[PDB]
């Protein structure tokens, strides 16, 4: 299958109660492998997956120096944005950047990312082209010229096409036991009687990786989105994920309903019906 | 590896 590396960056201003809180995490697929917290004691990039602890001290000195420059950079960014939008130093604000890699099943480069958000809305993003920007506001339009003048794309493209791709493959080789695995969902289902006259049918899926999964409820082999409940896919905490879909049904008509599961680890989609 | 020159807005 295909794979991805993404670094996510979050800086939030807390004016008058300290300097901005900055958090930088790194993922490969749905497995996190690095952390940095500006408020944390260590002031170093820390391993959060066992396969990356392999990396020498030069890796951590370097990645810590880079992530510190990001903390420093985003601190300025909140200040710059406040100025761009003519807003007051009183209010709290949040800054968000994402960049990363995609590779296909052939481990050849697929696409590159560099996206940015101010308090939850798209600010600026680099296009699929890796050579040009999409500015939302006039604010982002000024950021756009600043980056075109500097020639940001030049090596940012080289990083996402090159170094980012090169190192994602090295991570997939080193952590192949955790990254390249495919844990198929452990499906069951439960029946709770809300009363006489009604009943709930919950469709389980547990201990699966990666997180991508589909649960759908059919009434007599026909899709029903009416009176369903879909919970957000949730992490178990041990590198696996859980998801369930429920439907409230008339009592007696239990075996009229079927739950459709789709996962990459499942050779073809399992269907579930009440015993 | 991270990108080392995160550009300032």
């Amino acid at each position: 299958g295909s794979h991805s590396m993404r670094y996510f960056f979050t800086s939030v201003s807390r004016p008058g109660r300290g300097e901005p809180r900055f958090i930088a995490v790194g993922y490969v697929d749905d497995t996190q492998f690095v952390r940095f917290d500006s408020d944390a004691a260590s002031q170093r990039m820390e391993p959060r997956a066992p396969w990356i602890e392999q990396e020498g001290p030069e890796y951590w000195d370097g990645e810590t120096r880079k992530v510190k420059a990001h903390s420093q950079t985003h601190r300025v960014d909140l200040g710059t944005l406040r100025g761009y939008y003519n807003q007051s130093e009183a209010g709290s604000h949040t800054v968000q950047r994402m960049y990363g890699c995609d590779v296909g099943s052939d481990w050849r480069f697929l696409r590159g990312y560099h996206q940015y958000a101010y308090d939850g809305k798209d600010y600026i993003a680099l296009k699929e082209d890796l050579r040009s920007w999409t500015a939302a506001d006039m604010a982002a339009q000024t950021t756009k010229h600043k980056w075109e003048a500097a020639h940001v794309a030049e090596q940012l493209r080289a990083y996402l096409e090159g170094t980012c791709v090169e190192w994602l493959r090295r991570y997939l080789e080193n952590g192949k036991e955790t990254l390249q695995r495919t844990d198929a969902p452990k499906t069951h289902m439960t029946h709770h009687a809300v009363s006489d006259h009604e009943a709930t049918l919950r469709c389980w899926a547990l201990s699966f990786y990666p997180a991508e999964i589909t649960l759908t409820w059919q009434r007599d082999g026909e899709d029903q989105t009416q009176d369903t409940e879909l919970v957000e896919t949730r992490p178990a905490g041990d590198g696996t994920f859980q998801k369930w879909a429920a439907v409230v049904v008339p009592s007696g008509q239990e075996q009229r309903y079927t739950c459709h599961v789709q996962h990459e680890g499942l050779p073809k989609p399992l269907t579930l019906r009440w015993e | 590896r991270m990108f080392p020159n995160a550009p300032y807005l």
Partner: T-cell receptor, first 112, second 113 residues
């Protein structure tokens, strides 16, 4: 770790092209390479960058090999003022290091 | 427009000295380097805004570099030894893109007994 190599000395005839070579022996391909010039008791003066494709400006031109393991700074019609020490440096930025390692550089002496 | 003062400096062995650098404004990164006769510049320190993120493992302890307002930078040498004699170059860079490092005109420090 990110070092370059250039010949110590080189003579060029005034008005003809000066072709100063540099080997990016250990420089990562996705890192910028830079060129600087310097004369006695003065701060180094910047010339030109390099990444993938060749570059050119009023000061000079730099032509990058396919492998990007070697570059050539080119001063087209070398004036007497182009006599100086030339430094080819490469980024180590891909690791967490923002230093640059200068070697001895090539002392170009253009002959009138 | 990278500025440095003083352009020259003679100090007695054992005395303390300080150099200033006023970098190009809009430049997030500031570097110190030093240069002895007929050698290439040698890295000392790197600033990203106010933050000193990289010291030169070799040259420090008696040396102290600050950049309090993430603009101008000072470098202080307490109890100078003759071996501190060199040209001390300041440099600044935008901090992203071709991030080209522009040198200053240098402080030529000579320490005598």
């Amino acid at each position: 770790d990110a070092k370059t190599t250039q010949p110590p000395s080189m003579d060029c005839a005034e008005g003809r092209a000066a072709n100063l070579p540099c080997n990016h022996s250990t420089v990562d391909p996705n890192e910028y390479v830079y060129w600087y010039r310097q004369i006695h008791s003065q701060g180094p003066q910047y010339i030109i960058h390099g990444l993938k494709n060749n570059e050119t400006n009023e000061m000079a031109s730099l032509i990058i090999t396919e492998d990007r393991k070697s570059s050539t700074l080119i001063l087209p019609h070398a004036t007497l003022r182009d006599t100086a020490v030339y430094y080819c440096i490469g980024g180590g930025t891909t690791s967490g290091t923002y230093k640059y390692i200068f070697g001895t550089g090539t002392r170009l002496k253009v002959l009138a | 427009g990278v500025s440095q003062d003083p352009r020259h400096k003679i100090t007695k062995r054992g005395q303390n000295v300080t150099f200033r650098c006023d970098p190009i404004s809009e430049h997030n990164r500031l570097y110190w380097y030093r240069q002895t006769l007929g050698q290439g510049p040698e890295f000392l320190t790197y600033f990203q805004n106010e933050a000193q993120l990289e010291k030169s493992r070799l040259l420090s302890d008696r040396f102290s570099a600050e950049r309090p307002k993430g603009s101008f930078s000072t470098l202080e040498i307490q109890r100078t030894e003759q071996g501190d004699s060199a040209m001390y170059l300041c440099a600044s860079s935008l901090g992203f893109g071709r991030d080209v490092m522009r040198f200053g005109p240098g402080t030529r420090l000579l320490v005598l007994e």
